[PDB]
Amino acid sequence: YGFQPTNGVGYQPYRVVVLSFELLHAPATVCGPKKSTNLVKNKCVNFNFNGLTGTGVLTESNKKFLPFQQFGRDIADTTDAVRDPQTLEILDITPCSFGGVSVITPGTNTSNQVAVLYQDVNCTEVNVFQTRAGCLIGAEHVNNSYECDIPIGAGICASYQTQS
């Protein structure tokens, strides 16, 4: 090539690179770039660790995996721990609170007031009274003991007195 700086356009050195890809056999690919995103804590989230996909709340744990072990599971084979691939720390997985809702009625032929029980839910996640059957809203906790009227559970009952 006869090159010179006073050459016309197109008569300039153009450095060339080409790409040529391989996709025959084998599935062991190094892939390109990912894209992490730090990590919250103590909130119901949709997580994804490497392909492990689920939803729940992640806390820090007191387990100790083996250096090659990447996640844990319990009896009934549900995932209850995980290792995150950048900190090398193992995290507990807990399902995000759920339950049933029951309404306590003194009978519509007597009143329109109701109370509500959120079954086996702590009261923070919903005057307000914590039983062993769940969180109860709209009923006053008196100190006297009557015969059972409407069974709440675990030893607690409710009733329409006097008006409330």
Partner: protein, 148 residues
């Protein structure tokens, strides 16, 4: 809700299961491995000694973390052509190998390089196939590679 689930305008005293309840996911998170292998791409990027056209190089590329997303957004070249998928669809894949051949040609002949072409750099000195995957990138280097 009681009246709906009991299908009646009157209800009698009792306790009634009416619905379920559950907490909803606040957000989404993703975790993945760092890189452990930034991979090589500078040797051919920044200044460097290139070769002739029949002395076109070759490179078996081993595992590593890609970064095309930067060369795609770079666009500081005369040429960025992939006959194959868009580079938007490229930074999210997993191949076996990519091959890198390098040489320097003139500017008035780069359009001789397309899979299926003619001329002395397509007929001689180099050869593409007709079906193609990869991308071709070229840029002028007259500032450095031409001299008085």
């Amino acid at each position: 809700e009681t009246k709906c689930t009991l299908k009646s305008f009157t209800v009698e005293k009792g306790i009634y299961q009416t619905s379920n309840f559950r907490v909803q996911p606040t957000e989404s998170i993703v975790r993945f491995p760092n890189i452990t292998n930034l991979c090589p791409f500078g040797e051919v990027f920044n200044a460097t000694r290139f070769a002739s056209v029949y002395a076109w190089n070759r490179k078996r590329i081993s595992n590593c973390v890609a970064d095309y997303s930067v060369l795609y957004n770079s666009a500081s070249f005369s040429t960025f052509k992939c006959y194959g998928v868009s580079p938007t669809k490229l930074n999210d894949l997993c191949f076996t190998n990519v091959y890198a051949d390098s040489f320097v040609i003139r500017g008035d002949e780069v359009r001789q390089i397309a899979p299926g072409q003619t001329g002395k750099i397509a007929d001689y000195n180099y050869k593409l196939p007709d079906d193609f995957t990869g991308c071709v990138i070229a840029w002028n280097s007259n500032n450095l590679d031409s001299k008085v």
